[PDB]
Amino acid sequence: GVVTYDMEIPSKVPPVKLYKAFILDGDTLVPKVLPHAIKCVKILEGDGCAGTIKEVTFGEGSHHKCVKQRVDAIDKDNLTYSYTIIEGDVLAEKFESISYHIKIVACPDGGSICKNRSIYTTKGDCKVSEEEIKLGKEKAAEIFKALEAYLLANPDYC
């Protein structure tokens, strides 16, 4: 059994800049602008090549705990990014792998569209509420829009 959903969103930053900032610094930009939902990120293993592993702390309090995250494929041909939540508190008694599938596409407004799919391959075919799917979609959109709030002022991440 597997859960699967998406959060495709137009974004006020160009596709090459989304690739530099969001994809190629989804490891030190993603916590620096919203540490109430990504308190930390560090690498446990690798460098960004396929099979690289991060570990994540979300807010370090009674709201949420921890995640381990295998980078599956960064690909600059598409633009795309896959990574799997492989371990940590978030999978719980419901999910067993939250494998993201981001695609990035241009827009003439001076921006992009970011097609954030995710898989969620379950344990024991456990059911989940669509309101909790919204809570997951909405925390991801809150992290994303914190990076865009920097990238609308400063789209050239370095």
Count of C-beta atoms within a 10 Å radius of residue 149: 13
Phi, psi of 71 (to 5 degrees): -65, 110
Exposure string of 27-59, with b = 16+ CB inside 10 Å and e = fewer, is: bebbbebbbebbbebeeeeeeeeeebbbbbbbe
138, containing H or E segment? helix 130-151
Count of C-beta atoms within a 10 Å radius of residue 121: 15
50-55 long-range contacts (CB < 8 A, ≥24 apart) are 50/74, 53/86, 54/27, 54/83, 55/88
CB contact at 8 A, 114 and 9:
yes
- Domains of the chain from N-terminus onward: 4-151 (3.30.530.20)
Rounded CA gap, 149 and 151, in Å? 6
Burial of 109 (0-12, 13-18, 19+ CB in 10 A): exposed
Experimental method: NMR
* HSE-up of residue 101 (Cα within 13 Å, Cβ side): 8
Structure tokens at 93: 């008694």
How far are the Cα atoms of 34, 57, 61, 70 from residue 94, in angstroms, in the given order? 26, 20, 22, 19
